[PDB]
Amino acid sequence: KETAAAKFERQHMDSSTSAASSSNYCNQMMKSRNLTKDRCKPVNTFVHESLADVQAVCSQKNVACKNGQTNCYQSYSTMSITDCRETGSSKYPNCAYKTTQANKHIIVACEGNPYVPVHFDASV
């Protein structure tokens, strides 16, 4: 709620645009969220849905995390997602991404307090 909810918002949140059609998006985003910082992660998904829409999920379909379980909630319908896929090659500041845009549903974990998503599990 002070580093977790943040961490999630840092990596997975982007409620400034409905979608993302371009490798521009991915490349700038990973850079902007400093996700390339130190070592850029292979793959990363960004939700293009309102932060509230995403918290809402915390009280929707109760599912099984890809680990422990429940405390995992699945988005009723379909979310505007963008997948960031690493490309180029070379374990170093060389990080390029390709932008794949999907329409999938999300599986999140929530630490309520009021409710706040903290861990983005599977993206379908």
Side-chain angles (χ1 to χ4, degrees), residues 6-21 25-26 28-30 32-33 35 44-54 80-82 84 99 101:
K7 150 225 177 180
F8 178 106
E9 302 154 32
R10 195 222 317 166
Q11 283 143 152
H12 316 289
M13 264 300 126
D14 199 53
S15 313
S16 122
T17 201
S18 244
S21 213
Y25 186 78
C26 278
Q28 92 186 190
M29 287 305 281
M30 313 288 294
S32 313
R33 311 310 185 67
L35 267 146
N44 186 69
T45 125
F46 288 90
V47 195
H48 295 257
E49 260 126 40
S50 157
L51 155 89
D53 300 324
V54 176
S80 147
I81 275 88
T82 298
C84 287
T99 309
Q101 234 233 221

Side-chain angles (χ1 to χ4, degrees), residues 20-118:
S21 213
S22 100
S23 178
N24 192 304
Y25 186 78
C26 278
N27 281 278
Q28 92 186 190
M29 287 305 281
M30 313 288 294
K31 235 239 195 154
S32 313
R33 311 310 185 67
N34 277 290
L35 267 146
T36 70
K37 238 159 77 81
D38 315 298
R39 225 182 94 156
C40 12
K41 1 181 13 218
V43 21
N44 186 69
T45 125
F46 288 90
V47 195
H48 295 257
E49 260 126 40
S50 157
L51 155 89
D53 300 324
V54 176
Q55 327 199 126
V57 165
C58 294
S59 65
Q60 323 201 352
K61 288 196 272 177
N62 184 196
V63 290
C65 288
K66 262 213 307 160
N67 1 100
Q69 223 132 114
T70 163
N71 218 177
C72 260
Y73 307 73
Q74 178 210 357
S75 77
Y76 284 100
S77 173
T78 224
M79 312 254 89
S80 147
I81 275 88
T82 298
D83 229 322
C84 287
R85 235 144 237 146
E86 148 147 55
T87 273
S89 115
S90 307
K91 56 179 219 180
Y92 253 163
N94 157 106
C95 267
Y97 291 95
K98 60 209 23 175
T99 309
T100 235
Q101 234 233 221
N103 353 236
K104 350 158 211 262
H105 86 80
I106 82 245
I107 302 199
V108 316
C110 310
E111 289 322 312
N113 85 1
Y115 305 85
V116 318
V118 309

